[PDB]
Design an enzyme around this catalytic site. Structure first.
Site, PDB file in Angstrom:
ATOM      1  N   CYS A 145       0.841  -1.187   0.000  1.00 20.63           N
ATOM      2  CA  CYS A 145       0.000   0.000   0.000  1.00 20.63           C
ATOM      3  C   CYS A 145       0.879   1.241   0.000  1.00 20.63           C
ATOM      4  O   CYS A 145       1.958   1.249   0.603  1.00 20.63           O
ATOM      5  CB  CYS A 145      -0.935   0.018   1.214  1.00 20.63           C
ATOM      6  SG  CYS A 145      -2.017   1.466   1.299  1.00 20.63           S
ATOM      7  N   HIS A 146       0.417   2.289  -0.677  1.00 19.91           N
ATOM      8  CA  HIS A 146       1.176   3.525  -0.810  1.00 19.91           C
ATOM      9  C   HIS A 146       0.273   4.716  -0.540  1.00 19.91           C
ATOM     10  O   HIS A 146      -0.795   4.842  -1.147  1.00 19.91           O
ATOM     11  CB  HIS A 146       1.798   3.644  -2.204  1.00 19.91           C
ATOM     12  CG  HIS A 146       2.844   2.611  -2.486  1.00 19.91           C
ATOM     13  ND1 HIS A 146       3.937   2.416  -1.670  1.00 19.91           N
ATOM     14  CD2 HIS A 146       2.961   1.712  -3.491  1.00 19.91           C
ATOM     15  CE1 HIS A 146       4.684   1.445  -2.161  1.00 19.91           C
ATOM     16  NE2 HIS A 146       4.114   1.000  -3.267  1.00 19.91           N
TER      17      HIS A 146
END
Lengths: 93, 98
Positions: free
Chosen positions: A69-70
């Site tokens: 996830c970013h």
């Protein structure tokens, strides 16, 4: 607690379509998760959600084997310190 | 103490940005001027995380990309193109057991 609405809210960036075979696999694997597992997944990714939106992107369209996830920051090209300062204050709701 | 310089160093720059871009330097100068509570309030907006103790922000990572004249943020899921249901389920379990 409508998980169908959470799925419909989803957006897709480069590399993926809603009809892509991997996306269809993800949503069936996600819907099979128990409620506690769904919550732990949303905690890994970030309740009540029904307004949260998740954006899918293929790993090769960024810069590989596991899900990551970013947190992206979309920052307009400000040229002043004063407007930049004012923008931060607005983001601070 | 909070390790804001490390948090700055963890940053990545994507579509049309680099650490030397003048707007980036303007951002960090403005970011290092807020109070800790404003830094935390700003952090809360970019993620939604409640864990903003010193150890949390020290490992936090932010990705910058250029766009809309407002500052906005998104959570994006980098999903490898798995081929089987068995592989997808296993990747979900790895993601939530960590």
């Amino acid at each position: 607690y409508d998980w169908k609405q959470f799925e419909q809210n989803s957006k897709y960036e480069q590399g993926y379509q809603k009809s892509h075979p991997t996306i269809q696999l993800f949503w069936k694997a996600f819907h099979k998760l128990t409620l506690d597992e769904k919550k732990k997944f949303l905690f890994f990714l970030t309740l009540h959600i029904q307004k949260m939106e998740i954006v899918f992107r293929s790993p090769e369209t960024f810069s590989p084997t596991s899900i990551t996830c970013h947190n992206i920051l979309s920052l307009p090209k400000y040229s002043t310190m004063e407007r930049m300062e004012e923008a931060l204050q607005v983001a601070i709701n």
